[PDB]
Amino acid sequence: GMSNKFLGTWKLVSSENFDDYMKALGVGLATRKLGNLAKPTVIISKKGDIIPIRTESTFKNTEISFKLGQEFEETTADNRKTKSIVTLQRGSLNQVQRWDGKETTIKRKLVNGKMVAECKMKGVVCTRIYEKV
Ligand SMILES: CCCCCC/C=C\CCCCCCCCCC(=O)O
């Protein structure tokens, strides 16, 4: 299952290409400006076979909880209503969100103790790096 090394509180320390990623999602200008200024905290925990992931920022908070491989309803930070699935692939926690015939993937993996999130939407790739705190 998911490595226990994922468990904990993570703080964003770097974000590359988030603006174009948000544009690809259809996020408006004012929202993107605040999104680009946000430095969220991401909290990953485990309750039995349920995995909650909570995101906290001054602008927006989100929370999802899921079992691996089981589709669930998700409300995203930009208020998309998606059907989502999280899978585990070579130690990577891979989230796919589907809505209105579109899809985006968020892949989270551990790299030298940091958590690296890769966000992909229509060929646009955003990389966000988190430190454990
Ligand atoms: C996660 C960002 C929370 C608040 C800032 C975002 C503002 C508007 C929503 C547009 C971004 C929606 C996609 C967020 C993907 C975050 C992936 C991650 O770093 O965990």
Side-chain angles (χ1 to χ4, degrees):
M2 180 181 76
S3 170
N4 286 332
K5 299 179 180 184
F6 275 103
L7 301 173
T9 300
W10 299 91
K11 175 73 177 186
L12 185 76
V13 295
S14 168
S15 187
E16 176 262 321
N17 210 26
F18 195 47
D19 189 53
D20 286 336
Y21 174 69
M22 282 187 292
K23 281 173 144 172
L25 292 176
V27 179
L29 175 62
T31 300
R32 291 201 314 274
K33 285 182 191 173
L34 294 177
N36 287 318
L37 288 170
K39 295 187 183 182
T41 299
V42 171
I43 305 93
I44 303 175
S45 59
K46 200 178 282 161
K47 291 179 171 162
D49 58 347
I50 296 177
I51 300 162
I53 300 187
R54 171 171 180 76
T55 302
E56 298 178 348
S57 70
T58 301
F59 185 27
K60 292 287 181 181
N61 301 323
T62 62
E63 185 161 353
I64 60 177
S65 58
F66 57 86
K67 303 180 176 188
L68 292 174
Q70 302 191 42
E71 184 171 75
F72 60 102
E73 286 182 343
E74 173 176 8
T75 298
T76 66
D78 50 321
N79 204 27
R80 283 170 291 127
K81 302 294 190 173
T82 67
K83 293 176 184 174
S84 304
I85 312 174
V86 177
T87 53
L88 192 61
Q89 171 174 255
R90 294 161 225 111
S92 184
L93 195 72
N94 296 350
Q95 177 184 16
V96 58
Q97 300 166 338
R98 300 185 172 93
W99 78 106
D100 294 340
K102 305 163 195 172
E103 77 166 52
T104 184
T105 57
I106 300 171
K107 301 186 196 303
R108 294 176 174 96
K109 65 184 176 183
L110 301 178
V111 184
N112 300 100
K114 295 181 166 24
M115 181 174 66
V116 177
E118 174 198 278
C119 321
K120 186 164 179 175
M121 176 60 179
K122 294 184 297 189
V124 179
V125 180
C126 161
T127 303
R128 290 156 74 77
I129 307 174
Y130 295 80
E131 77 181 349
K132 213 169 189 297
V133 296

